[PDB]
């Protein structure tokens, strides 16, 4: 147990994870090695783009923020889900026809189709 | 000496035939 696998069990214990597989700590160290060597990948591309010698802290600060949109994109925020809902929640509920049998969407949104197959010649 | 002067004659005719006028485009 290295000092960063001894600290990876502390992080999962600080969460609600008391019983985990022992393969998890080997997996959470490969993710933590792939992440810092992808940030420092982009932090070396940005140091050469500004034409400097070393990798300063403002390069790593940009490399963190410029890959929080594609590598770790988020579920939509609460201020956006409220505005999408409150215009959807204002149209009234439609009425129901009395006898329509199976009630289904139009035929281009359902999965009912003639569903062919090849002639096994 | 024959290889040195005849190499530039394959390229000298490649500046007389093709690309007489220079054009442009919008």
């Amino acid at each position: 147990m290295p000092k960063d696998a001894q600290m990876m069990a502390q992080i999962l214990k600080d969460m609600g994870i008391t019983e985990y597989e022992p393969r998890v700590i080997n997996q959470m160290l490969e993710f933590a090695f792939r992440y810092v060597t992808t940030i420092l990948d982009d932090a070396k591309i940005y140091s050469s783009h500004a034409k400097k010698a070393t990798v300063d802290a403002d390069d790593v600060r940009l490399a963190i923020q410029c890959r929080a949109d594609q590598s770790f994109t988020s579920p939509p925020p609460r201020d956006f889900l409220l505005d999408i809902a409150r215009q959807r929640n204002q149209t009234p509920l439609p009425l129901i026809k009395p006898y329509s049998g199976p009630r289904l969407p139009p035929d281009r949104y359902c999965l009912t189709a003639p569903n062919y197959r090849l002639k096994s010649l | 000496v024959n290889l040195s002067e005849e190499s530039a004659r394959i390229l000298a005719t490649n500046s007389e035939l093709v690309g007489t006028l220079t054009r442009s485009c919008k």
């Binding site: 290295p2 000092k3 960063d4 160290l29 490969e30 090695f33 060597t37 992808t38 197959r117 090849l118 | -």
Partner: protein, 95 residues
């Protein structure tokens, strides 16, 4: 269409991946494969994908020169996977 005329060249072929293995991984993907020629086409297309990664790793090993037995070490597979969309990054020397 080329996909039909290729399938006549598949009646003499038999892939390494069995039909029960491929026919199970299509079941987790969302359908039960009824025609057993579709199972012989997704297994061949996935056998060809392994047979180019394991072949680019061979030519990566035969380009470092040792000529008796070729070991599939991670040093030959990791550059050979990056030509496709598999980017592994394994650590060493955990401090």
């Amino acid at each position: 269409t080329p996909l039909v005329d290729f399938l006549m060249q598949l009646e003499d072929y038999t892939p390494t991946i069995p039909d029960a293995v491929t026919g199970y991984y299509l079941n987790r993907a969302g359908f039960e494969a009824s025609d057993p020629r579709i199972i012989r086409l997704i297994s061949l297309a996935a056998q060809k994908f392994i047979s180019d990664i394991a072949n680019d790793a061979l030519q990566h090993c035969k380009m470092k020169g040792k000529d008796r037995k070729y070991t599939l070490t991670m040093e030959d597979l990791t550059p050979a996977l990056s030509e496709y969309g598999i980017n592994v990054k394994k650590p060493h020397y955990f401090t």
